[PDB]
């Protein structure tokens, strides 16, 4: 069992936090908020580093390029924005979604950005030029998550329509649809790319084998009925599943046995987002409007 303990509480967002992500070099945490801002904090000392601004409306998601030099943000103003982290300046504004942009991610090469929107489409963008390369009619309801696999050849998407879909990046064609219809609020590939972790709004997380299309594991005990809450594979120490919860707790499960091994307390509102540090046993969690803070937790395993 892990022993995550609170080390820092990061204040400064003036509305609900929507997503937190560690930089791939392990050095930074980026947070996006309904307050229209991105904030950059030190991963190991919790020190506030900078505020990044320019979106006209709230931000639902943020993601790092592989070299930790760029961010992409997804906003209610219907655009994504590509930022140089060092200078904080907006390099590109990615226009073309006709409704709120909900989720974003770089591919491993980080020449491409994938986005999902309330307009039910998934879009693939060229990082250098800001042009939309492809628009996939991915879903019949808002798209809750998008994620590249380890080489970027696949995109996985989830939606309130109840579907998980795996797309071939190069062609944009749908390679597989997981239908086995509760609303899917989050999805992401496992680090090796063989498995897919999907959250449904019936208080359930499921671990699927992509190539077999089979639910391998089910993780329960948390409250997830309304919000799109991030989940993670924790691999730095023990192999855990990590998720936020609507009871203001961070849940940690043993991946293989599906048993809850820890529940982190301290947030005062829905823990909308959790993220796992790339090298250290460190978790970042973030909560909604009644809390507005980010918390850093450290474990010996």
């Amino acid at each position: 069992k892990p022993n995550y303990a609170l080390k820092f509480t990061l204040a400064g967002h003036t509305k609900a936090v929507s997503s937190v992500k560690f930089s791939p070099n392990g050095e930074w945490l980026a947070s996006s908020s309904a307050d229209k801002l991105i904030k950059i904090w030190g991963a190991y000392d919790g020190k506030f580093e900078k505020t990044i601004s320019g979106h006209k409306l709230g931000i639902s998601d943020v993601a790092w390029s592989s070299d930790s030099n760029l961010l992409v943000s997804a906003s209610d103003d219907k655009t994504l924005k590509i930022w140089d982290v060092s200078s904080g300046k907006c390099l590109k504004t990615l226009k073309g979604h006709s409704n709120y942009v909900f989720c974003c991610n770089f591919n491993p090469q980080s020449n491409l950005i994938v986005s999902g929107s309330f307009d039910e489409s998934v879009r693939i963008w060229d990082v250098k030029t800001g042009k939309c390369l492809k628009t996939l009619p991915a879903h019949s309801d808002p798209v809750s998550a998008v994620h590249f696999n380890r080489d970027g050849s696949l995109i996985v998407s989830s939606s309130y329509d109840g579907l998980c879909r795996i797309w071939d990046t190069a062609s944009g064609q749908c390679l597989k649809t997981l239908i086995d219809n509760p609303p899917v609020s989050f999805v992401k590939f496992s680090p090796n790319g063989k498995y897919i972790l999907a959250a449904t709004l019936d208080n359930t997380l499921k671990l699927w084998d992509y190539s077999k299309g089979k639910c391998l594991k089910t993780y329960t005990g948390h409250k997830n009925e309304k919000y799109c809450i991030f989940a993670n594979f924790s691999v730095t120490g023990g192999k855990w599943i990590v998720s936020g919860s609507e009871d203001n707790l961070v849940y940690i499960w043993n991946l293989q046995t599906k048993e809850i091994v820890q529940k982190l307390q301290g947030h005062t509102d829905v823990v909308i987002s959790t993220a796992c540090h790339p090298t250290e046993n460190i978790i970042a969690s973030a909560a909604l409007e009644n809390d507005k803070t980010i918390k850093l937790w450290k474990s010996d395993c």
């Binding site: 609900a16 929507s18 309904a34 709230g58 998601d61 309304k226 919000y227 799109c228 909604l288």
Partner: peptide, 8 residues
């Protein structure tokens, strides 16, 4: 506000 903080 933002679409994630709103929910449903």
């Amino acid at each position: 506000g933002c679409a994630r903080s709103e929910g449903f």
